[PDB]
Every structure is written in structure tokens, then in C-alpha cells.
């Protein structure tokens, strides 16, 4: 016992709210509404939320508060046969830190590259431009924009890389930005919750300040309604399709990050008798609500572009870093008071990624701080090694061909691993741990048992909801490419090793412990499905 708790229950909520609100809320949800029938897309997004994402989100943080231990220790202390789950979850979290923090670094570079009276991603008469430039976007291939070239030819310096092998020099401005990233990560996560729960007040709330400013700015623009018209006009015929439900179900999963070990880690500091059920419902609503608001912030500006700049919206309604690093920064260069919005937009993108990153790296520390008592004794001088490890390798993500390395891990490092990882978390609870065993745990703290709805969701719907994704994920697998670059045969292979390096540790303990405990087989299977308290 005697494990420190959140200084204030707000410190917890802001910590989890900041985690689940990332750039996917900004660069993937509103594109998905656009791509998949406007307001009609909300139904499968709302269904998959209610039956899939929310019951899984509810789960991972109910386990945190209850078993009061970090991810690995937690999973070992309730089903030892599948203790390998906890490891893989942290391995996935481990790999993610190598590439996710780059998006923070990129936004940071754009941040103090905007301290001037005229932004540089507007013209095409610069040293790094191309005769194939255009003022704005277009539905043509090899004729990129003015910001599509500033991003590639100046910021990333990517055009000087012939592939994954050629990585060229190290963009040292970028490395300092990535240094600044992990540095403010360290000075926010070393002294424990007493500061992490405090820092998140800036990182979780600053986006909503900025989001409101650009929500006010975007709707007050010529053609702003046109973008909202593109955002929410319903085409229910999309519901009759099948890829929409996959697009919806997938976003709900990754826009909520359940089972990643982070909600477990964050919630493992709640007081025992805390109304987690009210927490999970509130936080997860704020998440989807932020995506909705953000979508208005994006398409208000998107519509302004098709009305005052003459661009086919299908050439600007995009997803991923193309939206937040090229498309949106190109429009705010036009509107007056430019240098303001740019500086606040990029710091919003920074505060969107930082609090989301904290939870991943905190899930790693909290995982083994409970399993390895050597760690918790001197933690400040643990993470300084982990982040320097994150930084040194992160110099690869700062090289000329560094994006090619980013794109690999985004598609492989946690793309399928955490999908089948959580899938075993759901089965390890709904059948091995048991709903009956699990319900009274929740009844003990929050006072009442989970209704029959959360039980049926945890038992039947959520697993097929996961296979619903993983089935479609694999059939939709093609060899990894980017633009006209096809990653080599071994490049695909190494990624599958990165992805497999986590899942492989699930049976690699289900067999290690299965042969390291004595007795019969049925005795071993029965002695290995008995929790810690008992």
C-alpha cells in the first residue's frame, strides 16, 4: 500500500483528456466525416463509440484504479498466463515514442519559424522552389503547392533522399526541436504526478483556447459555411456501405487509445472508491466533442479556400500531417493578422501532441516502476536515460530522409500490434478474469455493478469489433509505399518484426510460465488462471 495519488481529481481528468485528444482529432476525424457522408458518418462513428470504443475505454481505466498497479504488474497480478500482455503493451508504447514525438518537433519548428512579418510558405520565388510550383493545391500529381514544397524542400529536406537507405545529413535545427520536445517532457515527468498532473493544465487546456480562437476566426470568413456544408451534409448511402464502418470503428479505437497501458497507468493513481464510471463517460465525450469542434475549425478555413482562392476542395480536404502542416498553414497566410494564427496554431499542435505523448511515456515508467522496485527508488535518473535513448535514435527522425523512417513506424510499429494486444486484454477479462469476477470489483469502489449493457459489450460486441478492424486491416495491407517510393522487400520485413516483437511476447510468456510452474497440465492451467489477491 501507500502509493501516491492525484493531487486533485482534475489533475487526473486533464491528464487523460489531454492524452486522448491528439492530432487525429484534428487531421483524421473531420476528413472522415467529409470522406464518408458528412453527418451520416456520425452514426457508425457514434455506434462504434457506444458499443466498441467507450466500453473498452471504460475498461482499461477501471482496471487501473482497481488493481492500483502498473500495466505489467497489473496484468501479471490478475491472469499470470497472459502476463506477456503487459510487456507487449509497454513495448508498443516504447516504440511509439521514437516517432510520435517528431510531430511535436515539426510543429515546434514551424512555431519559431513563424516569428517574422511575412510567413515563408507562401511564395515560390525562393532558393528551394521548383518550376513546377503552384500558389495553392491542385488535383495534379507532380505540380505541388507553395507549402508542399516548403515542407519537403526546406523543412524536411526530404528531396535529397533516394529512399530509406539514403538518409543524408542531420537537420540540426530539427534535432534541437526534438531535443526541446523531450526536454520539456523530462521537466514535466520526473518529479512524478505532483508536476505531470499540473503541466497537463497547460497542454490539455491551451488547445481549447486556441481551438475557440480559430473557431471564431474560421466561421467569420468568406465561404466559411461552404466548408461546414462539405463537413456535415448527409449522404446516408454511406451507411449502407462497409468501409465506412471500418473507417468509423478504426478512428474510435485510436482516437481513444484504450488498452495502450496509459489509462491503466493514469488510473492506477486514483483513489480506490472513485466514480470511474463518471470519469470514463465524461472524458471520452470531451474527446469526441473536441473532434467535432475541431472539424468546424478545419472546414471553416477549408471552405474559405474554395471560395476566395479557387481550389477544388477534394485537393485540400485531406488527412494526416498534410492537413496541419501544409493545407491549413497555407490558408492562414492569406488572411490578415497571419503571424498571430500561425503561432497559436502550431503551439496548439504542440500541446495536442505533448499531453498525448506524456501518457505513453508515463505508462512505460509506471508499468515497471511497480514491477522493478529499483526503478521507483531513483526515477529522475531513469527517464533521463530512456529519453536520451529516445533522443539518439530520434536523430534518425531528424535526418534528410527522416520522414521515410517516421512513416514506417506509423504503419508498423503500433499499427496491428496494439490491435491484437487489446484483443487479448478483452478476452483475458471477459472469459479468463470473468465478468462476474470483474463486476463486483467495480461494485466495490463505485458502489454499483456495471449494467448488463457493459457486460454484453465487453463479452460479445467488443471482441468482434476488434476483429472487425483487424480482418479489414490485413486485407487492406499492401507493401509500404510513399508517393513514388516503394519500400524495399526487407523494409516491410523489419516492420513486421517491430510489430511482431510485441505480440510474440504474449505466448513467449504463456509458454515460459507454463513450463516454469510445477504440476500437471490441468493443475498448471488452473494454477495460472488464479489472480494475485487470492
Amino acid at each position: 500500500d501507500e502509493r501516491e495519488t492525484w493531487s486533485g481529481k482534475v489533475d487526473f481528468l486533464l491528464s487523460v483528456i489531454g492524452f486522448a485528444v491528439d492530432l487525429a482529432n484534428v487531421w483524421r476525424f473531420p476528413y472522415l466525416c467529409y470522406k464518408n457522408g458528412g453527418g451520416a458518418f456520425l452514426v457508425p462513428y457514434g455506434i462504434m463509440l457506444a458499443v466498441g470504443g467507450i466500453p473498452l475505454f471504460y475498461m482499461e481505466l477501471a482496471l487501473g484504479q482497481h488493481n492500483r498497479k502498473g500495466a505489467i504488474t497489473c496484468w501479471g497480478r490478475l491472469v499470470p498466463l497472459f502476463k506477456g500482455i503487459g510487456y507487449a503493451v509497454v513495448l508498443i508504447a516504447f516504440y511509439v515514442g521514437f516517432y510520435y514525438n517528431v510531430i511535436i518537433a515539426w510543429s515546434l519548428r514551424f512555431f519559431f519559424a513563424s516569428f517574422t512579418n511575412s510567413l515563408p510558405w507562401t511564395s515560390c520565388n525562393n532558393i528551394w522552389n521548383t518550376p513546377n510550383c503552384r500558389p495553392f493545391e491542385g488535383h495534379v500529381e507532380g505540380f505541388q503547392s507553395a507549402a508542399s514544397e516548403y515542407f519537403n524542400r526546406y523543412i524536411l529536406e526530404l528531396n535529397r533522399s533516394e529512399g530509406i537507405h539514403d538518409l543524408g545529413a542531420i537537420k540540426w535545427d530539427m534535432a534541437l526541436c526534438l531535443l526541446i520536445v523531450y526536454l520539456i517532457c523530462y521537466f514535466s515527468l520526473w518529479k512524478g504526478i505532483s508536476t505531470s498532473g499540473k503541466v497537463v493544465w497547460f497542454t490539455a487546456l491551451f488547445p481549447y483556447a486556441v481551438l475557440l480562437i480559430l473557431l471564431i476566426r474560421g466561421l467569420t470568413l468568406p465561404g466559411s459555411f461552404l466548408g461546414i456544408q462539405y463537413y456535415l451534409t448527409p449522404n446516408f448511402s454511406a451507411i449502407y456501405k462497409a468501409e465506412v464502418w471500418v473507417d468509423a470503428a478504426t478512428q474510435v479505437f485510436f482516437s481513444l487509445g484504450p488498452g495502450f497501458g496509459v489509462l491503466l497507468a493514469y488510473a492506477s493513481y486514483n483513489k480506490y472508491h472513485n466514480n470511474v464510471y463518471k470519469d470514463a463517460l465524461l472524458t471520452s465525450f470531451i474527446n469526441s466533442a473536441t473532434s467535432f469542434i475541431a472539424g468546424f475549425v478545419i472546414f471553416s478555413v477549408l471552405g474559405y479556400m474554395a471560395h476566395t482562392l479557387g481550389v477544388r476542395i477534394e485537393d485540400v480536404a485531406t488527412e494526416g500531417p498534410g492537413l496541419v502542416f501544409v493545407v491549413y498553414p497555407a490558408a492562414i497566410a492569406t488572411m490578415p493578422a497571419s503571424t498571430f494564427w500561425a503561432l497559436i496554431f502550431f503551439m496548439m499542435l504542440a500541446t495536442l501532441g505533448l499531453d498525448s505523448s506524456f501518457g505513453g511515456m508515463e505508462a512505460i515508467i509506471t508499468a515497471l516502476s511497480d514491477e522493478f522496485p529499483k526503478i521507483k527508488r531513483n526515477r529522475e535518473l531513469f527517464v533521463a536515460g530512456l529519453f536520451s535513448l529516445y533522443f539518439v535514435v530520434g536523430l534518425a527522425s531528424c535526418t534528410q530522409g527522416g520522414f521515410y523512417f517516421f512513416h514506417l513506424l506509423d504503419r508498423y510499429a503500433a499499427g496491428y500490434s496494439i490491435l491484437v494486444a487489446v484483443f487479448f486484454e478483452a478476452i483475458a477479462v471477459s472469459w479468463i478474469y470473468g465478468t462476474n469476477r470483474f463486476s463486483e470489483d467495480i461494485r466495490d469502489m463505485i458502489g454499483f455493478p456495471p449494467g448488463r449493457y457493459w457486460q454484453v459489450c465487453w463479452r460479445f460486441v467488443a471482441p468482434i469489433f476488434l476483429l472487425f478492424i483487424t480482418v479489414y486491416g490485413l486485407i487492406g495491407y499492401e507493401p509500404l509505399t510513399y508517393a513514388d517510393y516503394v519500400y524495399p522487400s526487407w523494409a516491410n520485413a523489419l516492420g513486421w518484426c517491430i510489430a511482431g516483437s510485441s505480440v510474440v511476447m504474449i505466448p513467449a510468456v504463456a509458454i515460459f510460465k507454463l513450463l516454469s510452474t510445477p504440476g500437471s497440465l490441468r493443475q498448471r492451467f488452473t494454477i495460472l488462471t488464479t489472480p494475485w489477491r487470492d
Partner: antibody
Amino acid sequence: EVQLVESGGGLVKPGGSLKLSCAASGFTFSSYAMSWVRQSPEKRLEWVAEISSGGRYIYYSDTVTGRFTISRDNARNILHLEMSSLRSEDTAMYYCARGEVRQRGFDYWGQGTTLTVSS
Amino acid sequence: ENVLTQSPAIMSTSPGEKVTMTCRASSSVGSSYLHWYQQKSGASPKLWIYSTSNLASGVPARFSGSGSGTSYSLTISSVEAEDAATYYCQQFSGYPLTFGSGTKLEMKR
């Protein structure tokens, strides 16, 4: 159609020992936390023990802890309370009360069985 | 141990009165964990009001619950003669669970 019915109960000498049992029908007994509440002959309601829906968390009264032992088995639909080191002030009518949700209290109460601890 | 103290012990009322009985507490109690029970003579109790104000099935709407913090109350709009019983308050905030001193409703004549 829910029913609780207590049993056992009778005269016992101080320091004695006795086991009371409650039979439950009309509902799925294996999914509702049960509690023993006794009320003295002076009509003072006093809680004794709570047992989980699966008996995994158990809370005792400070005045019975160690002397009293609550237990249940759900295949048989019976809830038990064994007493030992019985003192005189343990005399009461012992109620078997179904109370799963804390925020809603004890739904159904049995008819109660009487226990006397006297020399 | 958080002790609940009901008052009055005996309440003499005739059918038609507005009667209100209280249940003070030694320590603050969540508005959702306070309950009331009615116990007729020679019978087992019955859940009358849960979570301060919400009455159970069969409980006539002439009954009402209010109060919060460390001071709660039970109120009957218009007493009926069948309401002659003993009313207990009970708390689920923290263990050990405690009941109230009870208010016995007795009829006037």
C-alpha cells in the same frame, strides 16, 4: 417473486457458537451482494456483515469482527453466518438483506430468525 | 463510526397532518447513499426511500425525501392511518454501515 428466508437461530450460552443460514429464491442469487443486519430486542437496527456477489470482498462490524464469519455458496443459493465466542449482546433478530447497489440500499429483507445468548 | 441520530423517537400524529422526521449524522454522507426504511409492527423492514429522495415501488407519492450533508429528513404530505410504523434511516457512505435511531409514528386519539 423474490424471497429471503432465514434459519438456524435459538438459545445459546455465552461463549457458545451457532450458524444461521438464509435461503434465496425468486432471483439469481449469484449476482446480488447480501448482508446480515440484526436488530436488538430494543428495536435497534445494527449491521453485522456484507458479503460480495461472489464473496470476494467482505466487511465486518467492529463488534463481531473475528467472532463472526459470513459466507455464501451460490450453487445452493444459501447465505451463511457462523457465530463463535458468542456474547450476550449478540442477541437479536437476524435479517438477511439483499443489497447489491450501495446507492439503492437493501432491496428485499427476509422474515428474520431469532437468537438468544443467555446463561 | 458515523452514527445517525433520528428525531423524534415517538411522533404522535393523526391522519391528515404534515409530519417531518429528521436524521442528523455524525459525519457527512453522500446524497446517493442515504436510505430510509419503514418497519411495521411484527414485520421485517422495507426499503422506503433510496438515495435521499427516490422512493421504492408501492411507496405512495405522499412520501418525500430531502436534506443533504449531515442533516436529512423524511416528510409525509398527508399522513394516512396505515403510515403508523417505525421509520429508520441508513447510510452506505462508508463502513461500518449504520442505521438511524428510528422514529415511531403513533396515531393520535
